[PDB]
Amino acid sequence: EACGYSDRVLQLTLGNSTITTQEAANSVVAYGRWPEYLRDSEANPVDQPTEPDVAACRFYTLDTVSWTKESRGWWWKLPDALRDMGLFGQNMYYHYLGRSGYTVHVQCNASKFHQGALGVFAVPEMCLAGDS
Amino acid sequence: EACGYSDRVLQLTLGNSTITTQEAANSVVAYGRWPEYLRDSEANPVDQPTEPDVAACRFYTLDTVSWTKESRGWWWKLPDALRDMGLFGQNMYYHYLGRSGYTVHVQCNASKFHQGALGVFAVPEMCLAGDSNTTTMHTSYQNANPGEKGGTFTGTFTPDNNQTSPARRFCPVDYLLGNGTLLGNAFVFPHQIINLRTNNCATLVLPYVNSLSIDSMVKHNNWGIAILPLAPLNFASESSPEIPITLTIAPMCCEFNGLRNITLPRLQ
Amino acid sequence: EACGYSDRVLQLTLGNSTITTQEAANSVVAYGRWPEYLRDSEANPVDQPTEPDVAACRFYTLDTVSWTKESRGWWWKLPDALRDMGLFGQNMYYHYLGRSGYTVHVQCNASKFHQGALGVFAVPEMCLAGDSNTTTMHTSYQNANPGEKGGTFTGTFTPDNNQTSPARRFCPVDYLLGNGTLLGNAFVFPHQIINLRTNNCATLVLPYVNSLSIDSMVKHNNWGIAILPLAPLNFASESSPEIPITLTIAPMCCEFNGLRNITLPRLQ
Amino acid sequence: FCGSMMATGKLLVSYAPPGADPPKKRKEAMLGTHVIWDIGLQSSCTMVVPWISNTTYRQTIDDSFTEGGYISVFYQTRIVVPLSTPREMDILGFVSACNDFSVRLLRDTTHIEQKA
Amino acid sequence: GAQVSSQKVGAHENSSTINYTTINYYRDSASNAASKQDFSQDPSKFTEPIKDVLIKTAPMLN
Amino acid sequence: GAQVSSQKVGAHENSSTINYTTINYYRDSASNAASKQDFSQDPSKFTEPIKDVLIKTAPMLN
Amino acid sequence: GSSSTAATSRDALPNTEASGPTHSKEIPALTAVETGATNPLVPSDTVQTRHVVQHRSRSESSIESFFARGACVTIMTVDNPASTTNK
Amino acid sequence: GSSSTAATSRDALPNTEASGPTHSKEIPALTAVETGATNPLVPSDTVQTRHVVQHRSRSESSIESFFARGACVTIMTVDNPASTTNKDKLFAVWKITYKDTVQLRRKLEFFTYSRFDMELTFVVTANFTETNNGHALNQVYQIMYVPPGAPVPEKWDDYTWQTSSNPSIFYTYGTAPARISVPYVGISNAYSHFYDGFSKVPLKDQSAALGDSLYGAASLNDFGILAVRVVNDHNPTKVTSKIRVYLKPKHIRVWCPRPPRAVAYYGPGVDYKDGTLTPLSTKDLTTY
């Protein structure tokens, strides 16, 4: 926009939470598919579903980790990582079945004099190798 | 363009070669004239001309020189500088006559903490002054034509005194544009300034200029590329800084006449 | 033409070169196909091709050989034979790929009192037999490609016996077309006969032939030019007569792809 | 280019079709298909290796006859950085196929096995 | 119930589209052979999964 | 999808054109049998490859 | 009766278009992999190309074609001994 | 539904026309072979002919008709020994080609370039090797096609025989000879019966041995190989089998004709060998 608008500067708003960013490389939508509710044609469980909406469909900030010359990398699993997050974890544990999409926002700022590249990946069914 | 497009960011493509730049001060087209083939109304030599096209009309990168606090300036001549460049030099030597335009791209990057200004000039018939005070117009063919490595300017005029065995070469003094005229005025000539704080390089699109429709590329040099430090290189606090100046040039709409056996010049 | 025109008298003109002949037996166009540029529907390499035109598509005259009572025959390979010929060889070596047709003009005059018949043949993929009986397909790149001077045929097969340090070269026997087949049948191939009593020469217009639209001119030779004495040279009564056979060839509708640095082959 | 924002530079990415001496110096590399990459806001630079071959198809194995040529990289000018900044940085490289790209003659791979 | 289709013809003899006839003998789809009459799709969902559509001639980041 | 053609009939019985029926079972042209329905061409490109067309009643060389 | 018979797996890939020189503000070669996307570039974007009619196909690389082959998943061992054998 | 059905290969040759006497300036009989051309003459041009309705055809001499026959290109030998034997179970590996045998090769070689769908037919015969008396249950052969680049088998029973991607034919002894069709698989627009050049360019600046390569030889591995084995486990009594491969070129096209191979073949190239260069026999100039 000659009016000002730009790829690097975004504002995300979900429920009572809002995230701002002046230095972004645009945003990615997995397989070009935006999160959606379960359609009647594709539905399985016959009972009236529980849709928490704004109470759970908002932004939870996990424990901040430290990046250093020594760091080999970090990993998380969904929904596991959010299992203890306010009303979302409560509704997840009270129900036998549950389905959910996510807006993952990884924050990491520094300085024009710092170097480095973080490879941020979203992997379906991320089965990991054991220690035995 | 609200869409993104900008003066500082360009992409030049000729034949199999492409040049990109994120920090340019636009580009200059000598005398507002874009290179072109020889028209029938203006043609002289009656024989079917040789037009190498993509084989020669592409980007050749010459030997990279070093810019320092001490540097007085550098100079090159066209086509001389490209005489040994792939298929372009081959076609130039095999033919009696030849004409060509050029896209001159002078590359020189640094840092937001460096200082300095490179005055990049395209001079038609750039005749330079000799090293002798006892004789004149005596500079030898070998010395007048350095080829790809080009020549350099001096802050001081020091006359060749060896009357017996003369150096027979040029003594181009910086402030006098190496030719008897004041540098401050070189700007009347097609040019661009590489001001470290503003831009990475200089792009000059040169047309075939001359008293004739087509001439002897081996005997005569149509354009002279002069690069002088308008404002001396300077960095943070380092007493002896340094940065490279890489010069990439591409022949354009170039054509040749009078084909025969290859010309083997006495370049040494 | 009641106006004068005739089969025996021709004038060929390519670029800056012109060939005349008052004693020709017409001219032959291989497989009825006149040389042509690579069509879009049949093209492979996506890059803008290099078309030298008049600079390369002209007449080059190779080293003149001598025909005598003793001569068993001569052979050449294209493009190999023209590899060192002006701008054509230069463009061939600078490019990965290249394709070209040819106008082959074999010159050989004598006198109404001389006898003899030269069988001039244009052979596609002219693979020749080696000098070894202990090993096969062993003829070295250097020996398989004589360049302009070409090679020659032998009335007898004499095997390279030096197992330790092999000659690694061809042993082309005349009556077997140097390749395991009977000479008497070589006529199924595009050709002309230079019968001293009837004509001065042989003109063959060859098209680009091959399993591919375009290929490696340096690694692969598309055409083979074989010249054998069908009927032995003979004059008046002289026991050891002699007459020259001059071979002039011109590349046609030729084009090149995959431009890079010049290829410097190990030709010795 | 994974180096710092304060770090400038100009690199020369080259592609030389087979048949000649594999480029060992900018001079030779500059003579073939190439791209002069200028480091700035636009973090990355893409060089397209055009389909330039004698045969309609190449072999998925090392073969003199179906050889593709040479891909080399060089310093057009030189990586320049100010004080208080890292004089050394890493550049990551990625490869992918253009829309004109295809494969044929399905076969079993050597990249995996079952000795036993 | 015969299903007639076109063969994409490779190396033609010194001998107009050529066809091949197919007929299903079984009641269960699973029993059927592979048609090979398949469709291509644009890689977009993987090569350009970004929210804001990208124009190659312009600056990716703006 | 059946392809019906004519048999060039040799030795006829003491028994009007006779025909034979052909049907392609496979999707790949290569799988197909040889039609034998081939064409002839004039030897010219080999027997008379000369630039200037030649008339047999007249002098080859003139 | 007889039933006879958008981009097909066996359709010819896109033709290469003739491309000339360029001196513009448009920067195809320049980009930013950080965004998660892959530069949709083609030969004609970074070099001077000739016009080429493309005949090649992705027929054999299709999901069905890629797996359209019988593969060994196991070797079962059975037998039939003499009545007498103890085993 | 039903689809029913310019000069055809099987069309009757041109009729001979009635020709009378001649006293003219027209000279058909006279010519000049030097021009490279062959005199298009016919009986009626040099002699008095009667009218004849021609029924004869060139049907059987057409390119397809000429090659429309299954030809033996190789004989593969495999076996199935007794578990105990010290020597390895013998499984066959053949590099696909038409040059291991002479007959079909000479025919294809009447031409420089060729194009065609290939039909491979496999005739399998087995037999007992030892003056034994024990028997063997019906054998099942596995003919695996290993294209250039794919893991070539090292053992009659190693992981490669899984053929997850490669095409394999599981033939059952005593049953109608195995058969499969193959398209025009050349990396070129046509098969090259002859290649007047090399796969490598000897570069001065580079060591002699490095730039070296075989004359007339292109892809070190043109079309991969045929790996054959006996699937059945080692049998107390040893049984040796032989696989005869019949090659037939269908839907075929040929370019640039050549003179047939006049002397004994000597390797995959055009090379001839001493003592075989005298094909023709003694016959006097003036003797019928």
Ligand SMILES: CCCCCCCCCCCCC/C=C/[C@@H](O)[C@@H](N)CO
């Ligand atoms: C299960 C059986 C699969 C059979 C697989 C066969 C595929 C390989 C066929 C290659 C055809 C080669 C025919 C002769 C080509 C030679 O003339 C070449 N040197 C010429 O280009």
Ligand SMILES: *C(=O)CCCCCCCCCCCCC
């Ligand atoms: C649609 O199929 C009508 C045309 C029928 C053609 C004859 C079918 C050939 C034999 C089919 C019997 C099905 C086998 C269970």
Ligand SMILES: *C(=O)CCCCCCCCCCCCC
């Ligand atoms: C066109 O073929 C319609 C007529 C069909 C006639 C019956 C076909 C006979 C059996 C064919 C099945 C094809 C085998 C895969």
